[PDB]
Amino acid sequence: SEVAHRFKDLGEENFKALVLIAFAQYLQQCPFEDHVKLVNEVTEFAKTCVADESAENCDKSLHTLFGDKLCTDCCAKQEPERNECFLQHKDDNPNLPRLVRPEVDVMCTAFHDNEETFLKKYLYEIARRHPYFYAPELLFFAKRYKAAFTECCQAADKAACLLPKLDELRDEGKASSAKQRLKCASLQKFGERAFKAWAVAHLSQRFPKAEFAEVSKLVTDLTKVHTECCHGDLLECADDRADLAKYICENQDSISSKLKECCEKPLLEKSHCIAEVENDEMPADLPSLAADFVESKDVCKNYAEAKDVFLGMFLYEYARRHPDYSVVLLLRLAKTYETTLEKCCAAADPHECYAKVFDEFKPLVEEPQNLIKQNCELFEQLGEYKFQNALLVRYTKKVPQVSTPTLVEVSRNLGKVGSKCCKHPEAKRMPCAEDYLSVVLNQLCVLHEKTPVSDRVTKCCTESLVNRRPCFSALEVDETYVPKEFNAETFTFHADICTLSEKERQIKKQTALVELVKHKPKATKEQLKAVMDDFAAFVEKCCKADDKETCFAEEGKKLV
Ligand SMILES: N[C@@H](Cc1cc(I)c(Oc2cc(I)c(O)c(I)c2)c(I)c1)C(=O)O
Ligand SMILES: N[C@@H](Cc1cc(I)c(Oc2cc(I)c(O)c(I)c2)c(I)c1)C(=O)O
Ligand SMILES: N[C@@H](Cc1cc(I)c(Oc2cc(I)c(O)c(I)c2)c(I)c1)C(=O)O
Ligand SMILES: N[C@@H](Cc1cc(I)c(Oc2cc(I)c(O)c(I)c2)c(I)c1)C(=O)O
């Protein structure tokens, strides 16, 4: 019995949580209460199978079981065409209501009145809004979330206790989700082989001391865990993750020095820890790379004889000695190495042909460096806000067809690269920046894929996972784009507009800025400022009240 197998390994609590998430991620619109039930029904059924492994229907597969329940066009199908359906219907941008937070005390009263339905609510909302969220990590969040309510709903200043914590959690959660989406997207759109090279590059950087054989073992298990969470097999994913978590800590020595701290803590805490671990120190006298990959005579022999291993070795070797290189950069290098061998080994004298292969990397290594240098200079200069506006303008000219909410969204996060990476030494900027940009550009890709409107986005997004950043960067202003006419509907007054926070204000102002650029593509940084200002002055004036609605309306109609 598979149900019981999992129930036994994860325990009832985690099992009930994981199953809830599984349902919330498959049916994002359904009411909270409805899901809960299904869980209860399913959780009980497992218990019986735990009792009688031979009980009725305990021989079923988790997908069949869960699917059937969910069905009480997708349902009218059968396994596995039926499950592929639910996956295929996950909405990365559901039309769900805003999930704002009530009044501190209002929540607490609920956190107390009924504590289990409270957390189930948490796991429920997050899961439905992020159908790809990493189940395990979400449990970790669930705890940290409950903690806050247990240490803040009982103290002097609570809204000054809780809130600050609730902030940091939504941010970490958003980063987590964005991170897992890249992983699922990597797998689904480019295959596991693409994901494996990627993970190989990442672990070789975090574990330079580790042996290639060890890193491979980790990547294989790691590939299995993510395929599962990405494909809905949450229960098995949580199970398999814990095994790996346990494995890593046991062989901790032959892997990384930084795992020591991680291993002492509880399951969830130590898994999150490993997931966040910093690069171990890099071994000293390491044999030059050229020796085995350029100078050797067996280069072509090994390529033919075992390309997959040989190339994996190349990635592993290069990555481990270059923590100063973004993983996508290394992947390009690996790709270049292969192309060069693909041609060279057919050539007359292979040794001469692939002899200067390191030469061809130089260009590929400098490109990311200069760019990172440039925007960090620009950042020290403009600051987060003014920086995002620079990007916002830049990217709206590249892909005008893309809707405003998304352009503002993506540009904002592209702007956070600066505050999140430039406060680092050269040696640690590229991996920070370029690998962070991969996450943000993937948000664009997945959000744009639900209703494509720009071939330029689609081409860059689908052509290669590794060239995305170069692809977007290289993009010139879309000239075929026809200016969006003026539509006052965008700025229709709304009471809330005058009583906005600094964050909310900037988003309105940035929305305005995109709408402006979309309307006058050929504007100047200067003439854009002018317009933004007059408008800013207008809104500020009209907010200084009297009859607000009239000023905005009266004076607005005048501007329009
Ligand atoms: N920028 C990437 C780099 C990165 C990728 C992987 I693959 C990885 O290995 C794990 C192991 C476990 I256990 C997890 O639960 C997770 I998530 C990732 C680690 I460490 C770092 C990221 O941080 O995603
Ligand atoms: N004033 C600078 C020009 C400059 C403007 C921007 I806006 C910028 O920021 C990005 C960030 C990303 I991410 C891209 O993909 C791209 I293209 C540009 C950078 I770096 C440089 C000079 O003259 O030196
Ligand atoms: N219709 C929206 C409300 C809304 C009104 C205005 I007027 C507006 O325009 C600006 C322009 C600048 I420049 C600012 O600094 C600010 I604040 C607002 C925007 I964007 C949105 C709703 O229904 O929610
Ligand atoms: N009189 C013109 C219409 C027009 C109205 C406005 I108000 C305006 O100014 C802004 C400012 C911001 I900020 C925006 O995001 C946008 I869109 C337009 C511009 I330029 C032109 C005609 O019909 O010929």
Q: What is the DSSP string of 433-481?
A: HHHHHHHHHHHHHHHHTTS---HHHHHHHHH-TTTHHHHHHHPPP-SS-
From-to residues of CATH 1.10.246.10 in the chain: 1-91, 92-181, 189-280, 281-366, 367-478, 479-556
Pocket-testing residue among 486, 508, 522, 524, ligand 4, by greatest number of atoms within 8 A of Cβ: 486
Cα–Cα distance for residue pair 203/193, rounded to 1 Å = 15
Q: Is 2 annotated as a binding residue?
A: yes
User: What does the buried/exposed string (b/e) look like for 41-72 if buried means 16 or more CB atoms within 10 Å of the residue's CB?
Assistant: ebbebbebbbeeeebeebebebbbbbbebbee
Rounded to a whole number, what is the distance in angstroms from the first to the last CA of the chain? 68
Which contacts qualify for 402-409: CB closer than 8 Å, 24 or more apart?
402/444, 402/448, 402/453, 402/454, 402/457, 403/453, 404/511, 404/514, 404/515, 404/518, 405/511, 406/444, 406/447, 406/448, 407/514, 408/507, 408/510, 408/511, 408/514, 409/443, 409/447
For atom 18 of ligand 4, the residue with the nearest CA is 516
160 DSSP 8-state letter: T
Is residue 276 within 8 Å of 202, Cβ to Cβ? no
> b/e string for 91-105 if b means 16 or more Cβ within 10 A?
ebeeeeeeeeeeebe
Nearest residue by C-alpha to atom 15 in ligand 1: 275
Could you tell me if 209 and 319 are in contact, meaning their C-beta atoms sit under 8 angstroms apart? no
Ligand 1, atom 6, residue with closest C-alpha:
199
Whether the CA torsion 38, 40, 41, 46 is positive or negative: it is positive
Rounded CA-CA distance 336/330 in Å is 10
Q: Is 484 left (phi over 0), alpha (psi -120 to 50) or beta?
A: beta
Domain 1-91 = CATH 1.10.246.10: yes
Q: SS3 for 197? A: helix
Distances (CA, A) of 529 to 217, 502, 517, 523, 537: 55, 19, 11, 10, 12
Contact indicator for 18, 233 with CB cutoff of 8 Å: no
* 55 neighbors 49 (Cβ within 8 angstroms): yes
For ligand 2, the distance from its centroid to the CA atom of residue 91, given in whole angstroms, is 32
**Known binder of ligand: residue 231?**
yes
Q: How far apart are CA 234 and CA 268, in angstroms?
A: 15
Cα diameter, the chain? 85
Residue 278 DSSP code: P
CA 264 from chain centre, in angstroms, equals 28
Q: How far apart are the C-alpha atoms of 508 and 310, rounded to whole Å?
A: 53
Question: Which of 177, 95, 196, 168 lies closest to 135, judged by CA?
Answer: 177
Q: What angle do CA 91, 94, 96 make, to 5 degrees?
A: 150
The letter for the amino acid at 489 is E
Q: For the purposes of burial, counting CB atoms within 10 Å of the CB of 298, is it exposed (0-12), middle (13-18) or buried (19 or more)?
A: exposed
- The Cα 190–Cα 317 span in angstroms is 23
Residue 165: CB within 6 Å of ligand 4?
Answer: no
CA pseudo-torsion sign 429, 434, 436, 437: positive
Return d(Cα 473, Cα 395) in angstroms, integer. Answer: 9
- Atom 7 of ligand 4, residue of closest alpha carbon: 560
Q: Is the dihedral of CA 109, 112, 115, 119 positive or negative?
A: positive
Ligand nearest to the CA of 528: 4
> Residue 196 in contact with residue 224, Cβ under 8 Å?
no
- CATH architecture of the domain 281-366 equals Orthogonal Bundle (1.10)
Q: Which of 389, 528, 531, 534 to mutate to test the pocket of ligand 4 (most atoms within 8 A of CB)?
A: 531
Q: Report the C-alpha gap between 205 and 226 in whole angstroms.
A: 20
Q: Per the structure block, which two tokens stand in for 354?
A: 């692939």
391, 392, 407, 513, best to mutate for ligand 2 pocket (most atoms within 8 Å of CB): 391
| DSSP state letters, 44-58 | HHHHHHHH-TTSTTT
CA distance 119 to 107: 11
Q: Is 528 in the pocket of ligand 4 (CB under 6 A)?
A: no
> Would the annotation count 489 as a binding residue?
no
Write out the CATH class of domain 479-556: mainly alpha
Q: Kindly identify the ligand whose nearest atom is closest to the C-alpha of 237.
A: 1
Second CATH level (architecture) for the domain 92-181: Orthogonal Bundle (1.10)
Residue 531: enclosing H or E segment and its boundaries? Answer: helix 525-543
Nearest to 202 by CA among 307, 330, 332: 330
Q: Residues before each break in the chain (C–N > 2.5 Å)?
A: 72
Q: Tell which one of 367, 369, 373, 375 to mutate to probe ligand 2, the residue whose CB is within 8 A of the most ligand atoms.
A: 375
- 47, 24 contact by CB (below 8 A): no
Task: Tell me which residue has its CA closest to atom 10 in ligand 1.
Answer: 275
Using the mean position of ligand 2's atoms as its centre, give its distance from the Cα of residue 375 in Å.
5
The response to whether 243 counts as a known ligand-binding position is yes
Residue 487 CA: which ligand 4 atom is closest?
17
- The dihedral over CA atoms of 265, 266, 272, 277, expressed in degrees to the nearest 10, equals 20
549 CA distance to ligand 1 middle (Å): 52
Is 236 annotated in a binding site? The answer is yes
- Find, among 180, 131, 140, the residue nearest to 30 by Cα: 131
Rounded to whole angstroms, the Cα distance separating 471 from 448 reads 16
CB atoms inside a 10 Å sphere around CB 77: 15
What's the gap between Cα 534 and its chain centre? 38
Distance 530 CA to ligand 4 centre (A): 12
Answer yes or no: is the C-beta of 487 below 6 A from any ligand 3 atom.
Answer: no
CA distance 27 to 89: 9
CATH architecture label of 367-478: Orthogonal Bundle (1.10)
CA of 371 to the centre of ligand 2 (A): 7
Options 3.40.50.460, 3.40.50.1220, 1.10.246.10, 1.10.357.10; CATH for 189-280 is: 1.10.246.10
Residue 164 DSSP SS3: helix
Atom of ligand 4 nearest to the CA of 559: 7
What whole-number distance in Å separates Cα of residue 527 and Cα of residue 277? 47
Given resolution (angstroms)? 2.8
Burial class (CB in 10 A: 0-12, 13-18, 19+), 536: middle
Tell whether ligand 4 has an atom less than 6 A from the beta carbon of residue 532: yes
Ligand 3 neighbour 532 (Cβ under 6 A): yes
